[PDB]
Amino acid sequence: DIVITQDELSNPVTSGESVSISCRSSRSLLYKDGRTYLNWFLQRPGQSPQLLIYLMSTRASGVSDRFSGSGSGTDFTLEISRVKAEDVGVYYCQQFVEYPFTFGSGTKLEIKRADAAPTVSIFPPSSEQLTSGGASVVCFLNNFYPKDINVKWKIDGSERQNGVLNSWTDQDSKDSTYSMSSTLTLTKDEYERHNSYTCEATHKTSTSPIVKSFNR
Amino acid sequence: EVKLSESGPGLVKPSQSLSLTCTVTGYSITTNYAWTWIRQFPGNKLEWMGYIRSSVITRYNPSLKSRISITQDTSKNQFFLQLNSVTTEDTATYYCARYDYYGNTGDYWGQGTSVTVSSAKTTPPSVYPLAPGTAALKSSMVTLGCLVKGYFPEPVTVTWNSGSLSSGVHTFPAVLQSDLYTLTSSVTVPSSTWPSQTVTCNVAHPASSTKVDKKIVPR
Numbered sequence A: 001d002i003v004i005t006q007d008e009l010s011n012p013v014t015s016g017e018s019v020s021i022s023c024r025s026s027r028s029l030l031y032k033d034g035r036t037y038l039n040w041f042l043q044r045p046g047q048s049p050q051l052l053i054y055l056m057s058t059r060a061s062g063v064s065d066r067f068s069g070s071g072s073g074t075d076f077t078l079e080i081s082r083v084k085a086e087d088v089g090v091y092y093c094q095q096f097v098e099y100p101f102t103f104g105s106g107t108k109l110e111i112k113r114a115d116a117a118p119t120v121s122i123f124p125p126s127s128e129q130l131t132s133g134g135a136s137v138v139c140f141l142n143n144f145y146p147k148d149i150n151v152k153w154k155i156d157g158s159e160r161q162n163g164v165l166n167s168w169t170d171q172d173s174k175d176s177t178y179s180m181s182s183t184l185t186l187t188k189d190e191y192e193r194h195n196s197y198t199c200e201a202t203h204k205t206s207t208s209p210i211v212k213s214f215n216r
Numbered sequence B: 001e002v003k004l005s006e007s008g009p010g011l012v013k014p015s016q017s018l019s020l021t022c023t024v025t026g027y028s029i030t031t032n033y034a035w036t037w038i039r040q041f042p043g044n045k046l047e048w049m050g051y052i053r054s055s056v057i058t059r060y061n062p063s064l065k066s067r068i069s070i071t072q073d074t075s076k077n078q079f080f081l082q083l084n085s086v087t088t089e090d091t092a093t094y095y096c097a098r099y100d101y102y103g104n105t106g107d108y109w110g111q112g113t114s115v116t117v118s119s120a121k122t123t124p125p126s127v128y129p130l131a132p133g134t135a136a137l138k139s140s141m142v143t144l145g146c147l148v149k150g151y152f153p154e155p156v157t158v159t160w161n162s163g164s165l166s167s168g169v170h171t172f173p174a175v176l177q178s179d180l181y182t183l184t185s186s187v188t189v190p191s192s193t194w195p196s197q198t199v200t201c202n203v204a205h206p207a208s209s210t211k212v213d214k215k216i217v218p219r
């Protein structure tokens, strides 16, 4: 079975510069008809794979001309010219010379850009959930960069670490930033035993953490 | 134009059988194209499962042994996927596509369908509105959200104002815990549009045939 390796990530590329993504095969993909059967796909988060290149260098219909492919027999390159925010996602190559057809592991295009402070919002539990016996306090940290971020919860001044769930989105297709959701879950009774709830974010964009809070 | 669309159960118990359907419109499947099934595991790994061409010819991935079968109903322009004795390792997103002799698929891929193999039970989600505590700085932006908690299995579709509200929306991946998922979504809008204009989050959970529309109202 033909194995195709791809680097997990690319060095971050600035919107505007050109980048090259590689793919290597364990066997040659040149067919007895003189054509090399290698495909290049781009998959955006939540989207289905979309063909960019087939036959190693032919661009698919409707595909932007900023995309071009080349290669020998075991080494292939996809060149993306004048990279833009929209190109973010994972790039896969696929061999179509021998059965079973196989895909490479995928290379995620990481975009580099100017640092940005996240917009922080904190939400008290809803009255609907409070009737169920549960209580979730939610905190949203939107559109920040770089992806590295630290969130801390405090109840009445003291740090609480249990009952906290976090979630991060993929790099944004429009402005190349990251977003994150942080949820603190307590029982309704526990939530009632306190008054001050705080969400603290620590980012590279500031020495002092961004703090958001409310009083029950 | 040509369109492919997968359909099938979203949850299956281990050892049982999996059946999926791909409906093709705008093009006949009795043609000599490789109407194929591909799947993507959690982790993004893609695997070729097999294909059917010219109505009566097929080929399958050897790793699927003798538990896969691909057939078609010409009168409905549909081809199917059958996978027997599944295990949790068969949990993935399933896609149908149309490959040609040269490997070109064009934009002929379905939206994909999620299949989970688990003994856990289907549970509808509870949708809770997230409105800000008090009034923030006026003449600016305001973020609202929805918390979709306790459902199984994935996925769940979340939209705002039936889709008419698209920009400024962030839906975060779900976090699994105790056989139950929790997901959140935020939307940012001018402090003017809200609460003057109504903002509603629409949540649909296919596995339970449930739909919820929760309007966001000021505290």
Ligand SMILES: COC(=O)[C@@H]1[C@H]2CC[C@@H](C[C@@H]1O)N2C
Pocket (backbone or CB within 6 Å): A031, A037, A096, A097, A098, A099, B101, B102, B103
């Ligand atoms: C396993 O069969 C194949 O790969 C064939 C050959 C000929 C063209 C292309 C696609 C076919 O399925 N391949 C290079």
Ligand SMILES: [Zn+2]
Pocket (backbone or CB within 6 Å): A001, A002, A003
């Ligand atoms: Zn091998």
Ligand SMILES: [Zn+2]
Pocket (backbone or CB within 6 Å): A172, A174, A175, B169, B170
């Ligand atoms: Zn965004």
Ligand SMILES: [Zn+2]
Pocket (backbone or CB within 6 Å): A190, A193, A194
């Ligand atoms: Zn307490």
Ligand SMILES: [Zn+2]
Pocket (backbone or CB within 6 Å): B001, B002, B003, B025, B026
């Ligand atoms: Zn049509």
Ligand SMILES: [Zn+2]
Pocket (backbone or CB within 6 Å): B073, B074, B075, B076
């Ligand atoms: Zn029939």
